[PDB]
Amino acid sequence: DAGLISPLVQLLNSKDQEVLLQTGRALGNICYDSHSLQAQLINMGVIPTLVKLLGIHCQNAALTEMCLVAFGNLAELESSKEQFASTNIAEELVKLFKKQIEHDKREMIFEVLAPLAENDAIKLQLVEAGLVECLLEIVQQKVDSDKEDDITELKTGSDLMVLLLLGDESMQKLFEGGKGSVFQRVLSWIPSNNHQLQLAGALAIANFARNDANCIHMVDNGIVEKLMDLLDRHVEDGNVTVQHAALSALRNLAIPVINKAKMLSAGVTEAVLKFLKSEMPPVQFKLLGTLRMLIDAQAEAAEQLGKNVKLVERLVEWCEAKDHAGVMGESNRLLSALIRHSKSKDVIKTIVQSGGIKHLVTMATSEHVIMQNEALVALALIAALELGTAEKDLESAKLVQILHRLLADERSAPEIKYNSMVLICALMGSECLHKEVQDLAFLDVVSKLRSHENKSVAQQASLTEQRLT
Amino acid sequence: AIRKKLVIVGDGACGKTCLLIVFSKENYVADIEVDGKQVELALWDYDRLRPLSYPDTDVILMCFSIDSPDSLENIPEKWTPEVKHFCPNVPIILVGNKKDLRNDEHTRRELAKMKQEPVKPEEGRDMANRIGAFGYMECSAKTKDGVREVFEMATRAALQACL
Numbered sequence: 143d144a145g146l147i148s149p150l151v152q153l154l155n156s157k158d159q160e161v162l163l164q165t166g167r168a169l170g171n172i173c174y175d176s177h178s179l180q181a182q183l184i185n186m187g188v189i190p191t192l193v194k195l196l197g198i199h200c201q202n203a204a205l206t207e208m209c210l211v212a213f214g215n216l217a218e219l220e221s222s223k224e225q226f227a228s229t230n231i232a233e234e235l236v237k238l239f240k241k242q243i244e245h246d247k248r249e250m251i252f253e254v255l256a257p258l259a260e261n262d263a264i265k266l267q268l269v270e271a272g273l274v275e276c277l278l279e280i281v282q283q284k285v286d287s288d289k290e291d292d293i294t295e296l297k298t299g300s301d302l303m304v305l306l307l308l309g310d311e312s313m314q315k316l317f318e319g320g321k322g323s324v325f326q327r328v329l330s331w332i333p334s335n336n337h338q339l340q341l342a343g344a345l346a347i348a349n350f351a352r353n354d355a356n357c358i359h360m361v362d363n364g365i366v367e368k369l370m371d372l373l374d375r376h377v378e379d380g381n382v383t384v385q386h387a388a389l390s391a392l393r394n395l396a397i398p399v400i401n402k403a404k405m406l407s408a409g410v411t412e413a414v415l416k417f418l419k420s421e422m423p424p425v426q427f428k429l430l431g432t433l434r435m436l437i438d439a440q441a442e443a444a445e446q447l448g449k450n451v452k453l454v455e456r457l458v459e460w461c462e463a464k465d466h467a468g469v470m471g472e473s474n475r476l477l478s479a480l481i482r483h484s485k486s487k488d489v490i491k492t493i494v495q496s497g498g499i500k501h502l503v504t505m506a507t508s509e510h511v512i513m514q515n516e517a518l519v520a521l522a523l524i525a526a527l528e529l530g531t532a533e534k535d536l537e538s539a540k541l542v543q544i545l546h547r548l549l550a551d552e553r554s555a556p557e558i559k560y561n562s563m564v565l566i567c568a569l570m571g572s573e574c575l576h577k578e579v580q581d582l583a584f585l586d587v588v589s590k591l592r593s594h595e596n597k598s599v600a601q602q603a604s605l606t607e608q609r610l611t
Numbered sequence: 612a613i614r615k616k617l618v619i620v621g622d623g624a625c626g627k628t629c630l631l632i633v634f635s636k637e638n639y640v641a642d643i644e645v646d647g648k649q650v651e652l653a654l655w656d657y658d659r660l661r662p663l664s665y666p667d668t669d670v671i672l673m674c675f676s677i678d679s680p681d682s683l684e685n686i687p688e689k690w691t692p693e694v695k696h697f698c699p700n701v702p703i704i705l706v707g708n709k710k711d712l713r714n715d716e717h718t719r720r721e722l723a724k725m726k727q728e729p730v731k732p733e734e735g736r737d738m739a740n741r742i743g744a745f746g747y748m749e750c751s752a753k754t755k756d757g758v759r760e761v762f763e764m765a766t767r768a769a770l771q772a773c774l
């Protein structure tokens with residue numbers, strides 16, 4: 143077949159319009175639904191040759207159509223995008239999108255942009271060419287128009303704007319820095335009553351909000367306040383898709399330590415908790431995300447959230463759901479995080495009563511090592527502060543049995559903090575029952591000693607506490 | 612080479628993780644491997660958010676276990692609404708995990724204690740056409756029966772989206 147194609151491709155160099163149209167029709171079928179041959183066409187390499195054609199014969203209708211369909215098919219292959227990025231195709235598709243007006247002719251150009259856009263480098267090229275400008279005018283015209291064609295032309299342009307904001311270079315160019323000339327116009331979508339624009343806006347924001355510096359400069363210019371207005375609109379019912387998008391942005395805006403404070407004062411923790419009732423896991427997820435980020439360095443905030451019985455009861459409810467378990471995890475970590483940051487005796491008593499000990503214990507046997515000691519540290523706090531109120535539920539959970547298993551390990555340096563939760567749990571009468579289960583043989587081995595200096599000492603001190611008192 | 616992504620979802624993940632670890636020959640990369648025309652499948656601080664519709668997902672595998680008809684009836688209420696709203700236009704494959712334990716002495720007898728019996732392929736296809744699946748396919752994790760036939764089907768679903 144390389145016999146067949148070589149001449150067909152060398153025909154593409156023809157200045158004759160009719161020649162192309164036919165050599166095209168030929169090249170068309172086969173390779174129709176034969177990716178093997180399409181792939182070889184990339185090597186040839188036809189892509190940069192085709193981009194030139196589109197450029198020269200754009201005021202033609204017949205091949206320009208056919209040219210686009212080629213790109214749409216080729217772009218489905220992996221090799222294509224790097225090759226496309228060499229090309230002027232970004233400039234040439236925008237230069238075309240302006241000229242053409244008919245709904246059919248645009249949707250074809252859109253179905254080329256969308257897969258080509260996935261290439262982060264193309265994104266920048268498209269923004270530089272001025273796609274962003276066109277996209278926004280398509281939104282503006284058709285905001286309150288209810289033609290079924292017009293609402294889908296809106297959705298395309300709006301969701302594509304979002305897509306373009308996933309490229310780090312391209313996004314950073316548009317956030318000018320926020321507030322710039324585009325970012326402003328995208329912000330205004332969140333006050334808007336166009337359910338799609340609300341969605342796009344929230345998502346766009348969240349995508350802008352992907353580095354410390356941007357997220358700071360947004361919280362300070364009242365983005366946090368605007369997002370809460372959107373959430374407050376969708377509380378009782380019903381657009382789950384938008385709840386998510388808005389929450390998802392807050393979660394990001396609450397990453398850097400500086401904003402954590404500022405957002406609590408504005409009252410995000412309140413507005414976010416209104417969706418505790420939600421039964422939609424993605425909404426549940428970004429709720430729990432935003433809580434855990436808001437409380438990170440903030441102790442007093444965590445003390446109220448821990449004391450909040452409405453919340454803690456929902457968390458123990460989510461921990462005990464077998465599925466999803468994306469939301470189960472995030473929930474389980476927040477239980478730990480409430481205890482760990484507040485260090486409050488009250489928040490502990492709230493959680494032990496809600497039945498949260500048995501979950502923190504099973505989280506100590508998690509495959510992720512970060513979560514492991516988050517459980518162990520939250521359990522260390524539980525034992526140091528309020529061992530009496532906890533000890534009955536702790537035997538139930540089989541915590542003593544797990545810690546011995548943990549400390550003959552394959553392995554972690556997280557075994558240290560376990561040898562502390564053992565040393566601390568040891569001083570409860572109903573408590574172990576570690577002497578009735580023989581930890582002394584494992585402790586003196588670890589005493590002498592792990593590569594960690596810190597692992598040796600508490601273990602050598604744990605040897606002395608386990609022999610004497 | 613063509614890259615397509617495959618999400619997978621279901622009640623308890625000793626039924627599902629059994630399905631994708633058996634193809635060694637929350638993130639994994641198998642292949643065909645590679646039958647000459649190459650198709651690769653990727654599986655399932657700052658969050659990056661994708662619009663709809665331009666999702667980084669080409670096909671969902673909604674898994675239920677044949678030994679629990681509770682886990683089949685949960686599909687329309689627990690799994691489908693999520694995909695409804697967030698992943699529309701993403702083709703679905705309904706999948707009956709662990710087909711080996713259907714007519715078994717231990718587990719159809721234990722199912723009777725629930726006033727119940729195992730799931731038929733009638734009840735499977737009924738659900739598939741209900742939720743709007745691209746298709747159905749039962750498979751056993753432990754006996755290796757129908758396992759490649761799911762990843763065959765998933766890939767065919769992914770590809771199907773001149774002049």
Ligand SMILES: *C/C=C(\C)CC/C=C(\C)CCC=C(C)C
Pocket residue numbers: 154162163165166169170173174175180183188192195205206208209211212215773774
């Ligand atoms: C189904 C169509 C495929 C695989 C692509 C066929 C077209 C080309 C290759 C490029 C020919 C385009 C022009 C001559 C304008």
